Design a protein around this ligand. Structure first.
Ligand code: APC
Ligand code: MG
Ligand code: ZN
Ligand code: ZN
Lengths: 1426, 107, 134, 30, 277
RNA sequence: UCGACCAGGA
DNA sequence: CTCAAGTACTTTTTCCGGTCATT
């Protein structure tokens, strides 16, 4: 690391002070004067020229010789030089900020165009934020086109007060390439502002003024944005590529500098010599170009500064620009040593936590072990074994610090190992290693494993750890990393180890269970028909490495002593494991061998398959991991495998074409099921051709028809499929795999055996790519199943050529979507990760980012670690109010409702105890309180929620532990129970704080768990149900406290990253495997996309009208926006010169009932009017359906145009519906055509603007009954095809306490940022729940909380999160890299070095998890421990 | 509080900060037809006293910046005539804790 | 054979099941440096410069080319070539590190511009091992 | 495709633009 | 068993990969997005079968949307910045009375729906009533000859580039305008850009034809250059020889030098693991 | 010993 | 002197042999 001892003190970077280089500094920092464009070759001599590329700088040719600094190559960093430019030139990056500063200060005296006098200016100056203050000041001064001498005084505006002198008009500055041009002023003066001009103006900008702008007096003055003295980077930055002796070869950056130096030398000669004045501007602009082009070459203005080759030239900007760029490609991720990768293979004879390391690999990788008296003797035998034997070593590292290559060293045979030396030795069995499989979208994608050195070239790995990596053995490769420290080893073995990773916190369930062969065979082994004879049973038992040595008593003894499959499987299941299931008709005597019952680690009934032995929530793995431990579970995995795998090896399993073959009569049955459905289609087709069909809202007759086709043909495939599944015997190997849940599903059977079904591309059935026909083998206008891709055939039967091609199109759609949406999903993670990185739990249980700003006050609102959470019911929520009272009420003052003296000893003397009834009254009163609270929180009555401490399991154990006989009465007192639970609660601590804000925060975090606690430990429930002895109760009470405490989050928990991967991985998988929703809507949400694709607005009806369908119809009509355009057939312009009489005989009866009655001043206003008449016919159906009257319509036009248009109209009864219009008061022809445009497209007839196609819905609703119990109470709800929350909320007859929109942006503007969070979470949650997938609240809660805390909707884009007050180095690590860094210097940013990213760039132990605290030695204790 | 029908002159509306220490608040009738605070998704926001606030920042060891912010323009902040720097204690209901309370500093 | 993998008959593998033949052709040319400053094909040793390969040169003949019978293996030198300057810098092409085998066929010809052109083929037999895809 | 080029297209290119202030004739292919 | 159909370049088996391009001289109407000042567009990829290979594409646009008062039809002509109304083009081609111009677009005078859509376009063009006044409305005498030349050389260069075929181009223009208003009325369906019949493949021959033309023209420019320098043989074979050789070796087609602009992986080293590969 | 294209793997 | 539209800019999943030119 940099090599050789240095006396200088070793420190860690704690702050990064960004600024700009002042010319003065550039000169002082410089070691060489750099004046010759020639690198080296002091005319032929292969030695460097004292003028560029070491005119003193760094070094070449591996010569310690480096300007007396000695050291050379690995030791000496570079040494900077300089080059004094002939004229000042702009820095490419600051080109715009220079313009913006010119747009703020007077281009003559350098005084800010706006003063403390302007009131908006005072407000802008009041901004604390350096960048936001600059922004406001710019927007203000850009307008000011004159450096005012005098401005009106704060008192009277009548008397003016003088400020900074001089008048002068300010230019309107505009960019032209790399130049700045003004426009001062009939006709203006337009000239280019010189680099020198700008400079002397900037040099005149006062500290007060420029510090009022972004700038810093010490670190970044505005004048330093213009370049005078260029810093020359040393060779280590721009290395010379030597390709022999004679083959020189220099870097790109070396060429550009030489070119700047070439351009400079010209400009200087023109000046210092006969100045040709207009050739100087040419040579000046060339210098500007090169200096620009060297720092940035991907500039807007077309010249790419191409190297003569056709290559553009790598700018310095281009070097750092992300992924491959210095930040993302060299610092955020690196190529690493002590790494290995090979093909992976599955091994059932490996431990869950082992990894098979090929001897080749074990012999190359090395752990450097320190020569300690503990190892000294072993280590010598490894060194003496050398690098070729397996247990051996490659190098001996002396105290002196020098490597001994045992492969060559003449003393390799010798070496008398002194202590303190290091021996780099071959990896050995049981060394911790980090194993991973790319793409790494999980905490689990990288796990620590024990080594097992094996022969043959693959990494062998236990099959049940396949799922977390998502690895298959079809030629997958995996990466291995070898830790080098004894402390880094501990890191892996103590946090990253596989056994630890078993229960996953993203799902609050185990991420690994029993798979494939072992799962298929565990079902087979289990089922009641499976019996094992002695000879084999004994081998099965020996196979369990932890077998107690006890041959269990055979289930059957009678003639042959036989053992059950379940019986000897229970040998792998450890004692005290209690599990209860109940599936279909599971009845404590499950006739179907349904569900599951395991007591004391023994199977009582039911088959073992996926729902037990898999990675299920309530399944055996989550239970052993919780109750028995992580290493205990890691064993259970192996022991199930060792037995199941063995049994199956000797039982066998297969799959033939016979497994797809369905019965002969069953086949005819399937064939006629298709036939009856094709005849059902034909019917709906010829009926729709006969124009009789009626389309269901928001659909064409065509759209509505196509739904029915698709529906009949999908109903068909599924019932046809079901016939086959049903006809398949229990012996069907394919059925047997679907059964255990090892591989395959219903649809997999259906398509193979029965029929493939309908094919789809873009949601629709194969459409006409050719004209009105799917293929040239069809006649036009054929809509039949066969035509638009229906596969009537099974895979076993075989496909017709047309079916084959249609399936081929549908199949291709799958590969495209997997490819298209795989990057989109990936970028989504990168963004989610870069947004949440720095968020962790601090030792105060508060969730904060790198700025220490609170995101969550307590992790996931409860302070609980998601791994330690199981779904548990809340039996206080549901049921009738009666059943509740039965369940929990104890009334010692009523002879019928007391605790019977059969339940507790005190039962007899307890009756009438008014003091104890006082205790039991509060008890029940609180349970009733609880019920009301829970029904408040979960409005639907949902009682199954994930909570910590599985109370059921605790009671379940207490019974099997204390052999609880449900016969004899308990030793508990009312006081014992009531007061015991009260006291337990006080001990379930999350937050410790002795104040009242924290003690109230504590009280609050437990609120729900206590509801559950009191629910489960009521005096009645404890005594009557559980039948607990005092002894058992104290045990239950302690084990709740115990378990709760462990269940809380750990300060350091990288809660931020976790949450991002927890939302990320699902999305990335929900694509990889072959109304807006999924990846596109998730994109919408994260981007806080304004114009969203499906804006909708769910509108609930007034409480006293919920089921009144008629009330809904009224609102439906009252909100759906109707335009005249929608009810008009055609509009016509007629020349009817007399108004009183009409040329149109159809309009005879119209003028009659309108001129006679409407005699109300219509004579003089008007008896013409306009001879030009606009007449429009309306549709009866359009008018009727979208409920309207000619009178209604007519008056709207009459009030849109007021009295500038004379409107008349035909009556509703009339056979032709018409509206006649005339103007009121030269070229009136086109003047009237404009009136019809405003009439069709700009008039509202009914409803709310932005609201389209409103539909009714008969929604179900879980509502409590007056009896108590929740019941299905349907209601009417309307859904929109547009959004205007603003006005639809006000609409009468609706519930505005319920109204919702899928556009959370609108919710946050109408109901605030708090309601914004609610809506945002709701939408996020549903895009995840859309693909079935479960994410534990907390993660989505965190992402939602993050976007929100800021005060608004902060997008997970470069536009949103990446713009915050976080570290410069941290933000430049995502999306806008070089620019972020340029503005860092230009506004003198200071980086805390608190973020992860910063420490990772700095190569420092991040303040993350293991590094979230400090370690100290205490001398007090050092002398005490001896 | 001045409750207007359609609008107020830009001339008239630029007379609001003319009378300190006192403050003025403009509200459109149509906006006030519905009490947005009564909606499902809108939790209870509560104004903190100079001391309540002072104490919160002490007990959570916070700088004013470190607190989640409520915008001055925010519908609920407008309902409670929230002034720059005032803190609201937001009591919401949790599917996880039962009850969780946050805080928001004004903008 | 679990999860997309397979078991294979080793007894069948011996009898010649799925055996492969792998060939690789290594190519070289004598470089020319304008003023008749040409590289040469030769088995070099020490000499003034000393820039040379780790691997054994002892397999090469006097033409700096291995005969077609030899069994090559590590970083063994396959072609011995040298570049002088203003003298053993090296220009020799060693057998691909990972690889090993038997020299199959060696051809010595001339490039269109009169330079010594050499292609060397190295044959090996590939036995279906464990990580081997099928 | 190549045969079509060699036979026809090649003679076409050498004769469409061709002629300078020097003209081009029949194309030959060895 | 070796089938051939590839090249041996510097002792390397190179395969020329077929290139899928959209067919040319093909008349195609497409609809424009929601925020567009143009509702529909008629496009024609006019190119000479052999004769440089004309990159010029004519756009015939329908300005205004459905429900926008007075919809106008303009067309972008190569080397004249603005998109000029079709009536002016017709007058600049020779067809001067609006009704002979109508007869060029609508092939039936019992079709008022289409003709009503033409009425505003007739009004737009009405400012200019003569052929010379139309050629002038292509920005005097200088701008008139310039116009004359563009309509002959760059406007519809397939058909003919010759002279008097002004009528042929006018009927064609009208055919494009007919096919434009045809999808505007929703009588014809919008053209499919993915119909495989409206695509072409460029194999070994045409890819070489493109390459060769460029290289030959580059030697023609050297032959002319040597002629100028001859102030009183020289034909550098290398330009053709190495020119073709580089394109086929690099695969980076282009070939002029080359650079980044143009190319791909057109020429590829032929797969030989198995026969079928 | 430098990096660009092409072709591939899960 | 407001606000519609045109203008430009910046992103796009993760790891893992041959051939060309030229350094
Ligand atoms: N372009 C890509 N980018 C990232 N990962 C990829 C990838 N292609 C494949 N993978 C990885 O490989 C996994 C699945 O691909 P494959 O293993 O080739 C299919 P399979 O599991 O063998 O059979 P299947 O097709 O029945 O699923 C993915 O989940 C992913 O981890
Ligand atoms: Mg795989
Ligand atoms: Zn040095
Ligand atoms: Zn001034």
């Amino acid at each position: 690391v940099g090599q050789q001892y240095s006396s200088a003190p070793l420190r860690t970077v704690k702050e990064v002070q960004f600024g700009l280089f002042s010319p003065e500094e550039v000169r002082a920092i410089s070691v060489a004067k750099i004046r010759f464009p020639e690198t080296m070759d002091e005319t032929q001599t292969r030695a460097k020229i004292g003028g560029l590329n070491d005119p003193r700088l760094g070094s070449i040719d591996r010569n310690l010789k480096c300007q007396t600094c000695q050291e050379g190559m690995n030791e000496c960093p570079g040494h900077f030089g300089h080059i004094d430019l002939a004229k000042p030139v702009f820095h490419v990056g600051f080109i715009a900020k220079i313009k913006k500063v010119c747009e703020c200060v007077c281009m003559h005296c350098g005084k800010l165009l706006l003063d403390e006098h302007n009131e908006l200016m005072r407000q802008a100056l009041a901004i604390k934020d350096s960048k936001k203050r600059f922004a406001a000041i710019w927007t203000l001064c850009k307008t000011k086109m004159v450096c005012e001498t005098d401005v009106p005084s704060e008192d009277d505006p009548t008397q003016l007060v003088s400020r900074g002198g001089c008048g002068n008009t300010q230019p309107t500055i505009r960019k032209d390439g790399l130049k700045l041009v003004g426009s001062w002023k009939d006709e203006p003066e337009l000239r280019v502002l010189s680099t020198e001009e700008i400079l002397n103006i900037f040099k005149h900008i006062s500290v007060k003024d420029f510090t009022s702008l972004g700038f810093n007096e010490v670190f970044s003055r505005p004048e330093w944005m213009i370049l005078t003295c260029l810093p020359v980077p040393p060779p280590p930055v721009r290395p010379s590529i030597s390709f022999n002796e004679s083959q020189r070869g220099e870097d790109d950056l070396t060429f550009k500098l030489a070119d700047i130096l070439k351009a400079n030398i010209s400009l200087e000669t023109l000046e210092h010599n006969g100045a040709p004045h207009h050739a100087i501007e040419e040579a000046e602009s060339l210098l500007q170009f090169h200096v620009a082009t060297y720092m940035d070459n991907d500039i807007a203005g077309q010249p790419q500064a191409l190297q003569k080759s056709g290559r553009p030239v790598k700018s310095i900007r281009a070097r750092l620009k992300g992924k491959e760029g210095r930040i993302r490609g060299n610092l955020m991720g690196k190529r690493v040593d002590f790494s290995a990768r090979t093909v992976i293979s599955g091994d059932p004879n490996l431990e869950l936590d082992q990894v098979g390391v090929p001897k080749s690999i074990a012999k190359t990788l090395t752990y450097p072990e320190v020569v300690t008296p503990y190892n000294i003797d072993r280590l010598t035998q490894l060194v003496r074994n050398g690098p070729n034997e397996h247990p051996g070593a490659k190098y001996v590292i002396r105290d002196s610090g020098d490597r001994i290559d045992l492969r060559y060293s003449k003393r390799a045979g010798d070496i008398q190992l002194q202590y303190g030396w290091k021996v780099e030795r071959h990896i050995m069995d049981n060394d911790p290693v980090l194993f991973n499989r790319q793409p790494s979208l999980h905490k689990m994608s990288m796990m620590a494993h024990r080594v097992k050195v094996i022969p043959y070239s693959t990494f062998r790995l236990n099959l049940s750890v396949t799922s977390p990596y998502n690895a298959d053995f079809d030629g997958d490769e995996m990466n291995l990393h070898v830790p080098q420290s004894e402390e880094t080893r501990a890191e892996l073995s103590q946090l990253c180890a596989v056994p630890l990773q078993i229960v996953s916190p993203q799902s609050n369930k185990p991420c690994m269970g029993i798979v494939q062969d072992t799962l298929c065979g565990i079902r087979k082994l289990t089922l009641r028909d499976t019996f094992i004879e002695l000879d084999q049973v004994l081998n099965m038992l020996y196979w369990v490495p932890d077998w107690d040595g006890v041959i269990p008593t055979p289930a059957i003894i009678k003639p042959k002593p036989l053992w059950s499959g379940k019986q000897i499987l229970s040998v792998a299941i450890p004692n005290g494991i209690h599990l209860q299931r109940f599936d279909e008709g599971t009845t404590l005597l499950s006739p179907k061998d349904n569900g599951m019952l395991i007591i004391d680690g023994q199977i009582i009934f039911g088959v073992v398959e996926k729902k037990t032995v898999g990675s299920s929530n309530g399944g055996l793995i989550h239970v052993v991991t919780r109750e028995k431990g992580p290493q205990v579970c890691a064993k259970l995995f192996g022991n199930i495998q060792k037995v199941v795998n063995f049994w199956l090896l000797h039982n066998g399993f297969s799959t033939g074409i016979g497994d797809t073959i369905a019965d002969g009569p069953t086949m005819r049955e399937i064939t006629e099921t298709i036939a009856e459905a094709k005849k059902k289609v034909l019917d709906v087709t010829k009926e729709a051709q006969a124009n009789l069909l009626t389309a269901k809202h928001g659909m064409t007759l065509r759209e509505s028809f196509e739904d029915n086709v698709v529906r009949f043909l999908n109903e068909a495939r599924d019932k046809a499929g079901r016939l086959a599944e049903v006809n398949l015997k229990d012996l069907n190997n394919v059925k047997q795999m679907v059964m255990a849940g090892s591989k395959g599903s219903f649809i997999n059977i259906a398509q193979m055996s029965a029929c493939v079904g309908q094919q789809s591309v873009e949601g629709k059935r194969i459409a006409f790519g050719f004209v009105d026909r799917t293929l040239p083998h069809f006649s036009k206008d054929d809509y039949s199943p066969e035509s638009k891709g229906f596969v009537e055939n099974s895979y076993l039967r075989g496909l017709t050529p047309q079916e084959f091609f249609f399936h081929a199109m549908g199949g291709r759609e799958g590969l495209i979507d997997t490819a298209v949406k795989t990057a989109e999903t990936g970028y989504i993670q990168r963004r989610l990760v870069k947004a949440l990185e720095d968020i962790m739990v601090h030792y105060d249980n508060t969730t904060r980012n790198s700025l220490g700003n609170v995101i969550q006050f307590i992790y996931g609102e409860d302070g609980m670690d998601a791994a330690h959470i199981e779904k548990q019911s809340l039996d206080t929520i549901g049921g009738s109010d009666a059943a509740f009272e039965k369940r929990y009420r104890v009334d010692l003052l009523n002879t019928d409702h007391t605790l019977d003296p059969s339940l507790l000893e005190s039962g007899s003397e307890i009756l009438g105890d008014l003091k104890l009834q006082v205790l039991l009254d509060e008890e029940y009163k609180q349970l009733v309180k609880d019920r009301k609270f829970l029904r408040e929180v979960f409005v639907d009555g949902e009682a199954n929620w994930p909570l910590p401490v599985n109370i059921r399991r605790i009671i379940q154990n207490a019974q099997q532990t204390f052999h609880i006989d449900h016969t004899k009465p308990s030793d508990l007192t009312i006081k014992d129970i009531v007061l015991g639970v009260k006291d337990l609660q006080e001990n379930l601590l999350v937050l410790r704080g002795k104040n009242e804000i924290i003690q109230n925060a504590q009280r609050d975090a437990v609120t729900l768990f206590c509801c559950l606690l009191r629910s489960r430990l009521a005096t009645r429930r404890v005594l009557q149900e559980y039948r607990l002895t005092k002894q058992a109760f104290d045990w239950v009470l302690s084990n709740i406290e115990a378990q709760f405490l462990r269940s809380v989050v750990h300060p350091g928990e990288m809660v931020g990253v976790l949450a991002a991967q927890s939302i990320g991985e699902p999305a990335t998988q929900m694509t990889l495997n072959t109304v807006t929703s999924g990846v596109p809507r998730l994109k919408e949400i994260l981007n806080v996309a304004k114009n969203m694709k499906t804006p909708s607005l769910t509108v609930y009806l007034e409480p006293g009208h919920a089921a009144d369908q008629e009330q809904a119809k009224l609102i439906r009509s009252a909100i759906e926006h109707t335009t005249l355009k929608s009810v008009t057939i055609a509009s016509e312009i007629y020349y009817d010169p007399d108004p009183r009489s009409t040329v149109i005989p159809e309009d005879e009866e119209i003028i009659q009932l309108h001129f006679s009655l409407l005699d109300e001043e219509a004579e003089q206003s008007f008896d013409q009017q306009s001879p030009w008449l606009l007449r429009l016919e309306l549709d009866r159906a359009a008018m009727n359906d979208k409920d309207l009257t000619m009178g209604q319509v007519g008056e709207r036009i009459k009030q849109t145009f007021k009295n500038d248009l004379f409107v008349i109209w035909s009556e509703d009864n009339d056979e032709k519906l018409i509206i006649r219009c005339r103007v009121v008061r030269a070229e009136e022809d086109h003047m009237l055509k404009k009136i019809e445009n405003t009439m069709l497209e700009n008039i509202t007839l009914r409803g709310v603007e932005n609201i389209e196609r409103v539909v009714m819905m008969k929604y179900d609703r879980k509502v409590p009954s007056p009896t108590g119990e929740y019941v299905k109470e349907p209601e009417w709800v309307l859904e929109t095809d547009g959004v205007n929350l603003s006005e639809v909320m006000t609409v009468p007859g609706i519930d505005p306490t319920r109204i919702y929109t899928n556009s959370f942006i609108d919710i946050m503007e109408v109901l605030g940022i708090e309601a914004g969070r609610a809506a945002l979470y709701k939408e996020v949650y549903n895009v995840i729940a859309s693909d079935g997938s479960y994410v534990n609240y907390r993660h989505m809660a965190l992402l939602v909380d993050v976007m929100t805390t800021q005060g608004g909707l902060t997008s997970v884009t470069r536009h949103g999160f990446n713009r915050s007050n976080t570290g410069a180095l941290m933000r430049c690590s995502f999306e806008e890299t070089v620019e972020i860094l340029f503005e860092a210097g230009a506004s003198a940013e200071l980086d805390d070095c608190r973020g992860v990213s910063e420490n990772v760039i700095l190569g420092q132990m991040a303040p993350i998890g293991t590094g979230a605290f400090d370690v100290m030695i205490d001398e007090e204790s050092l002398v005490k421990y001896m | 509080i001045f409750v207007y029908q359609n609008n107020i002159t830009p001339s008239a509306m630029k007379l609001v900060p003319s009378i300190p220490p006192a403050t003025i608040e403009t509200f459109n009738e149509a906006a006030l037809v519905v009490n947005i605070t009564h909606h499902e998704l809108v939790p209870k926001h509560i104004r903190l006293s100079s001391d309540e606030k002072r104490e919160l920042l002490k007990r959570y060891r916070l700088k004013e910046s470190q607190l989640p912010r409520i915008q001055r323009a925010d519908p609920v902040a407008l309902y409670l005539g929230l002034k720059r720097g005032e803190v609201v204690k937001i009591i919401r209901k949790s599917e996880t804790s039962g009850r969780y309370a946050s805080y928001r500093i004004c903008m | 054979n679990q999860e997309d993998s397979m078991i294979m008959n080793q007894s069948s593998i011996d009898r010649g099941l799925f055996r492969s033949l792998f060939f690789r052709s290594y190519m070289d040319q004598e470089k020319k440096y304008g003023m008749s400053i040409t590289e040469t094909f030769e088995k070099p040793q020490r000499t003034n410069t000393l820039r040379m390969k780790h691997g054994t040169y002892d397999k090469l003949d006097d033409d700096g080319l291995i005969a077609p019978g030899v069994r090559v293996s590590g970083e063994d030198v396959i072609i011995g070539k040298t570049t002088p300057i203003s003298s053993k810098r090296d220009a020799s092409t060693p057998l691909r590190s990972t690889e090993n085998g038997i020299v199959d066929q060696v051809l010595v010809t001339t490039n269109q511009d009169g330079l010594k052109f050499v292609k060397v083929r190295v044959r090996t037999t590939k036995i279906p091992q464990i990580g081997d895809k099928f | 495709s190549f045969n079509q080029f060699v036979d026809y297209t090649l003679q076409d290119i050498i004769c469409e633009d061709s002629t300078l202030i020097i003209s081009f004739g029949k194309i030959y292919v060895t | 068993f070796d089938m051939g159909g590839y090249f041996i370049i510097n002792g390397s088996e190179k395969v020329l990969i077929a290139q899928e391009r959209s067919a040319g001289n093909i008349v195609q109407v497409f609809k424009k997005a929601a925020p567009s000042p143009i509702s529909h567009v008629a496009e024609i990829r006019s190119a000479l079968e052999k004769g440089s290979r004309f990159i010029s594409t004519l756009q015939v646009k329908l300005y205004g949307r459905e429900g926008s008062s007075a919809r106008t039809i303009k067309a972008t002509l190569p080397y004249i910045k603005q998109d000029i109304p079709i009536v002016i083009i017709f007058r600049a081609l020779g067809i001067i009375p609006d009704g002979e111009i109508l007869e060029h677009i609508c092939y039936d005078v019992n079709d008022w729906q289409m003709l009503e859509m033409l009425k505003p376009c007739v009004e737009d063009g009405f400012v200019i009533q003569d052929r010379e006044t139309a050629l002038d409305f292509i920005g005097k005498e200088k701008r008139i000859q310039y116009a004359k030349d563009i309509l002959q050389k760059e406007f519809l260069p397939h058909i003919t580039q010759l002279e008097g075929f002004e009528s042929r181009k006018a009927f064609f223009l009208g055919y494009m305008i007919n096919r434009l208003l045809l999808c505007a009325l929703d009588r014809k369906d919008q053209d499919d850009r993915d119909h495989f019949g409206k695509k072409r493949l460029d194999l070994a021959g045409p890819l070489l034809a493109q390459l060769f033309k460029t290289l030959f023209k580059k030697l023609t420019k050297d032959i002319f250059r040597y002629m100028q320098r001859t102030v009183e043989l020289a034909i550098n074979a290398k330009t053709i020889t190495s020119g073709l050789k580089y394109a086929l070796a690099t695969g980076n087609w282009e070939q002029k030098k080359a650079m980044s602009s143009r190319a791909a992986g057109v020429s590829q080293v032929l797969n030989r693991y198995t026969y079928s590969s």
